[PDB]
């Protein structure tokens, strides 16, 4: 059977809208009464729902201190709701943009180590995330007080990369690995981790973000490389990760070693 | 007494809440540190003096369970006390959102830590005057499995001696009854009332009840409820007596909390 827990509609209450994901609306919710996040999938075709079920399946089969927990899935007729863990401070990118110019390098290094740690665990299990970006990095603890460190939870990838259109894949540039643009290896999470490091270094302002779909696509087609981070401590690491040859990208074991 | 902070050194951020005659904000202090800014309302010199005395007192103390005071900024008609920022904030708020899921072992650690901070002030013959869950801050939550709490007792804000009868009545049940019409005996009553609030998951007795009712309760010398937790029942009965001399020392309270 299904490799995820089934949630009955009588067990869940839907509350405040928090934002939007790829083909989803995210709400705060209560699970019979635990505070949760409800990822409501748009009215979708069976191939989209199936890519969503695969994400829930994958997440239910994993357990790591830096990966957000999935409670299960609710199928209320034409609607698919993924019931997941609620993370106190929400998306990292939003927070980096609120605190721009006041985020110390030491703090960013802790986030990077924690993210590499979560991705190393998936690598060893030969599991592909497919959507590593600052928006899917959630802050459990901000680490603002003296002698406190940030604590992140990497969210589920949402609707699997394989189910998305070219337009959606182009929207995921620079986080999307270039081998994914035509359209699944763990080598893609190494590019995604690299692009996330740049976004963190540049305080939630990723390269090419303002740039149009045509421009983003043009950049990948012509094999242009992304800027070097302002931070020189992560410059080598991002140059290695952000290569167009997936085999050339280092393992997370090496990345973790290089970070610590 | 206390360090003077120039307005060019601080940055005022989000509003966190309110204290007696103050507005509390998140902030940044250059040499960058995350801080809390306690902005005093436009006030008279006797109110500002009671606020300077608090800053003075809190600059002269050093304990792992007392929040640090960086100094004071004087911006136009506003007196800004620059203090330590604590990660999780007020205990009472946290107890209310986690009601029915706070273990007795956790509450016992908080009680020991609070008695420890108050024992230090008693030995130095220093009065806090505002012991309540709102003034108890969590550096470490301890709510998660395998985490233990770590509290910081905040500064008392505007000293009790500067407040009106109206404000004193609003402080019931934390306010010692001899204060309704300054000794370290008042902090024993305050510690007792805080233990009830902790036991009742941030729901203090008489909280909702009107000023007239609160005042009536003290005037008629009625005693506060026994805590649901039997382990702290004796301790709260001893602390919450109308005779200040009858209240035990923090040395005794601390000793009793180990057993
Ligand atoms: C697995 N858990 C989550 O995904 C999740 N958990 N807690 C959150 N807390 C939270 C606190 C304050 C404000 C907003 N959020 C946000 C979350 N998702 C979220 C929220 C808004 C926009 C997009 C997404 S997402 C990652 O793309 O699903
Ligand atoms: C000495 N330091 C403090 O007093 C203080 N330090 N850190 C805080 N963190 C904090 C984190 C999250 C949410 C709210 N707060 C709150 C604080 N005060 C506070 C905040 C809101 C309401 C009343 C007061 S108070 C005790 O009456 O000053």
From Swiss-Prot, chain A:
User: Where does the Protein kinase domain lie?
Assistant: 12-260
Q: PTM per UniProt?
A: Phosphorylated.
Tissue distribution: Observed in all cell lines analyzed. Expressed in a variety of lymphoid and non-lymphoid cell lines.
Residue(s) carrying Phosphotyrosine: 27
Q: Which family does it belong to?
A: Belongs to the protein kinase superfamily. Tyr protein kinase family. JAK subfamily.
Record's subunit section: Interacts (via FERM domain) with JAKMIP1. Interacts with PIK3R1; this interaction is important for cell migration. Interacts with MPL/TPOR. (Microbial infection) Interacts with Epstein-Barr virus protein LMP1; this interaction inhibits TYK2-mediated interferon signaling.
Disease field reads: Immunodeficiency 35: A primary immunodeficiency characterized by recurrent skin abscesses, pneumonia, and highly elevated serum IgE.
Chain's role: Tyrosine kinase of the non-receptor type involved in numerous cytokines and interferons signaling, which regulates cell growth, development, cell migration, innate and adaptive immunity. Plays both structural and catalytic roles in numerous interleukins and interferons (IFN-alpha/beta) signaling. Associates with heterodimeric cytokine receptor complexes and activates STAT family members including STAT1, STAT3, STAT4 or STAT6.
Name of the molecule in the record:
Non-receptor tyrosine-protein kinase TYK2
Name its species.
Homo sapiens (Human)
- Entire protein: shown range: 578 to 867 of 1187
């Amino acid at each position: 059977q299904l490799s995820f827990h089934r949630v009955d509609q009588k067990e869940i209450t839907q509350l405040s809208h928090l934002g939007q994901g790829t083909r989803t609306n995210v709400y705060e919710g209560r699970l019979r009464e635990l505070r949760v996040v409800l990822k409501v999938l748009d009215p979708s075709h069976h191939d989209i729902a199936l890519a969503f079920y695969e994400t829930a399946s994958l997440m239910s089969q994993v357990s790591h201190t830096h990966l957000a927990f999935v409670h299960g899935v609710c199928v209320r007729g034409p609607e698919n709701i993924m019931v997941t863990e609620y993370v106190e401070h929400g998306p990292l990118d939003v927070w980096l943009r609120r605190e721009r110019g006041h985020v110390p390098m030491a703090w960013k290094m802790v986030v990077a180590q924690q993210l590499a740690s979560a991705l190393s665990y998936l690598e060893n299990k030969n599991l592909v995330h497919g959507n590593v970006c600052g928006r899917n990095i959630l802050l459990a603890r901000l680490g603002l007080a003296e002698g406190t460190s940030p604590f992140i939870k990497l969210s589920d990838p949402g609707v699997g990369l394989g189910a998305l259109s070219r337009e959606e894949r182009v929207e995921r540039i620079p986080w999307l690995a270039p081998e994914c643009l035509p359209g699944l290896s763990t080598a893609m999470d190494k590019w995604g981790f690299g692009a996330t490091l740049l976004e963190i270094c540049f305080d939630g302002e990723a390269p090419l973000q303002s740039r149009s779909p045509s421009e983003k696509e043009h950049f990948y087609q012509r094999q242009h490389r992304l800027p070097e981070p302002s931070c020189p401590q992560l410059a080598t690491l991002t140059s290695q990760c952000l290569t167009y040859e997936p085999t050339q990208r280092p393992s997370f074991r090496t990345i973790l070693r290089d970070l610590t």
